[PDB]
Scaffold this active site. Structure first.
Site, PDB file in Angstrom:
ATOM      1  N   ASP A  13     -10.061   5.783  16.071  1.00 52.44           N
ATOM      2  CA  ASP A  13      -8.739   5.401  16.558  1.00 52.44           C
ATOM      3  C   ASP A  13      -8.180   4.063  16.415  1.00 52.44           C
ATOM      4  OD1 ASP A  13      -8.713   8.072  17.415  1.00 52.44           O
ATOM      5  OD2 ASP A  13      -9.784   7.240  19.299  1.00 52.44           O
ATOM      6  N   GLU A 185      -0.923  14.704  17.677  1.00 49.70           N
ATOM      7  CA  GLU A 185      -1.307  13.435  18.621  1.00 49.70           C
ATOM      8  C   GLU A 185      -1.107  12.131  18.092  1.00 49.70           C
ATOM      9  OE1 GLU A 185      -5.696  12.954  19.604  1.00 49.70           O
ATOM     10  OE2 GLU A 185      -5.820  14.820  18.310  1.00 49.70           O
TER      11      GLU A 185
END
Length: 522
Positions: A13, A185
């Protein structure tokens, strides 16, 4: 020129940001302490570690956190002289619910002291703070729906953040539901040419991962999705060196060039990512109709990417050996869930040596005396020199190759009722405990022990020798390390393989283990 992955090994991420001529990327750390890893670059080609913001339990308390819980995707931003770090402490993620709490900490310097947290919300993970040009600040995150007949990824939510009141304020609105790729997301807001661009991650962080872009004239939508979505993905392309392309963030250089930092995976034996999710970067160009596209006109991640027009700025290479002479642990070292404490981890009790006092087993999610670093290459060598005086089978100290409590390899020194001081190899696979040697190998009571491991992609072999010995001796069989990966368990895992030192004293006497040095060579 840029060679991916830019941040090899466990670095998921990526949240990238440019402050003047400096570039920073924050990555998720899950149960590994300290929390949030930040790397720095000046040319996007060369990177170095600069800091890990969450170093106090007042900021991050993970004792007892289940594996792959803790720090999920983070967000690093900058505005008017202050760095903003949004993070999430995940307490429960298996099952129908998601118990995750989002926080905000600030700093004036990327490494400078970081503040204690300000609590935001818990409606979902992947929180991101957007600084609009009107002085207002907004927080977006995914919302989790645990109800029976609904898709859990219920979309992207938006709520204003008041820095004055240090809390979220006003109405909450669901601004985007994502595409048919689903599992929407990782929301990130960007403002460009009159549009509010919403970048999101979709498909799940596994092989169907993707990054899709959407836009709207208003921050609260409705958002139109890029007709050519997704922006990046590796889905049905096993030939790609970089798999799982998704969950990215965008940055614009001083020249107006755009790049997409995103995570990826490099599977062994078809699907086992022993190195976890790594960070890669792609050059992206804006299209005539206002969308983004990978530099080659495609939809896939490239292993080699054209570098930005900036002066090359390489960094000094990190040392191969840590002799433990400094009073503070080298930045590459991490502990599990809790901060290292003098009571069980000391560099001053015996200068030049890392003294660890035995605590809980390798299967405990509470307090383990384990210190390790990320494996960042498929080909590497690890070695340490240990001085330990075990008196019971409840005493163990040695070299560990660790993924989590369910999968790890441990070459250690212990005590046997018949052989006295001896050497053994513990391997836990799928949560199943095992010993790789029929009988432990007796060791000389008054000699230090050298432990070594050599990894080459899917397999590794262990070696050892004692002080006065001239040659290394192989120990145990060749070991297939693919069980220590993101893909080998019943459910996905989010970390990666770590290599380091550990010791446990299951009798409770805090028996010390002195590691003279540790070497990590790729």
């Amino acid at each position: 020129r840029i060679q991916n992955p830019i941040l090899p090994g466990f670095h998921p991420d990526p949240s990238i940001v440019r402050v003047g001529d400096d570039y920073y990327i924050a990555t998720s750390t899950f149960e590994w302490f300290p929390g949030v890893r930040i790397h720095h670059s000046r040319d996007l080609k060369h990177w170095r570690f600069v800091s890990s913001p969450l170093t106090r339990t007042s900021q991050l308390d993970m004792k007892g956190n289940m594996n792959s819980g803790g720090i999920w995707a983070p967000c690093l931003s900058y505005h008017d002289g202050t760095f903003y770090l949004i993070y999430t402490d995940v307490k429960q993620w298996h099952g129908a619910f998601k118990d995750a709490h989002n926080y905000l900490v600030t700093a004036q310097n990327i490494e400078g002291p970081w503040s204690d947290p300000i609590y935001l919300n818990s409606s979902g993970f992947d929180p991101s703070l957007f600084h609009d040009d009107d002085g207002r600040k907004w927080l977006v995150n995914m919302i989790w729906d645990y109800r029976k007949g609904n898709h859990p990824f219920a979309g992207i939510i938006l709520q204003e953040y008041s820095e004055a009141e240090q809390k979220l304020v006003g109405p909450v609105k669901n601004i985007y539901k994502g595409t048919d790729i689903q599992l929407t997301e990782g929301p990130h807001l960007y403002k460009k040419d009159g549009y509010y661009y919403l970048l999101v991650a979709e498909g799940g962080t596994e092989y169907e991962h993707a990054a899709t872009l959407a836009r709207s004239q208003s921050i609260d939508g409705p958002y139109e999705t890029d007709p050519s979505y997704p922006l990046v993905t590796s889905t049905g392309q096993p030939e790609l060196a970089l798999q799982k392309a998704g969950h990215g963030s965008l940055v614009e250089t001083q020249n107006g060039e755009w790049y997409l930092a995103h995570l990826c995976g490099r599977p062994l034996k078809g699907k086992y990512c022993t190195l976890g999710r790594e960070t890669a970067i792609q050059k992206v160009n804006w299209t005539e109709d206002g969308w983004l596209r990978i530099e080659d006109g495609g939809n896939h991640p490239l292993r080699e990417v054209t570098a930005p027009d900036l002066p090359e700025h390489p960094f000094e290479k990190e040392p191969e050996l840590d002799d433990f002479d400094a009073p503070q642990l080298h930045h590459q070292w991490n502990t599990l869930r809790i901060p290292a404490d003098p009571s069980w981890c000391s560099l001053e009790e015996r200068p030049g040596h890392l003294r660890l006092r035995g605590m809980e087993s390798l299967t405990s999610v509470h307090s383990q005396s384990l210190v390790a670093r990320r494996q960042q290459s498929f080909h590497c060598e690890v070695e340490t020199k240990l001085e330990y005086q075990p008196e019971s089978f409840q005493h163990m100290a040695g070299l560990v190759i660790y993924y989590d409590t369910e999968d790890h390899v441990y070459l250690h020194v212990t005590w046997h009722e018949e052989k006295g001081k001896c050497l053994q190899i513990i391997q836990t696979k799928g949560g199943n405990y095992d010993e790789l040697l029929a009988s432990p190998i007796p060791l000389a009571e008054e000699k230090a022990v050298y432990l070594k491991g050599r990894i080459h992609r899917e397999t590794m072999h262990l070696y050892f020798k004692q002080e006065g010995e001239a040659e290394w001796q192989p120990v145990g069989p060749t070991i297939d390390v693919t069980h220590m990966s993101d893909d080998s368990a019943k459910q996905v895992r989010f970390t990666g393989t770590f290599v380091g030192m550990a010791t446990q004293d299951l009798s409770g006497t805090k028996k010390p283990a002195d590691f003279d040095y540790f070497r990590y060579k790729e």
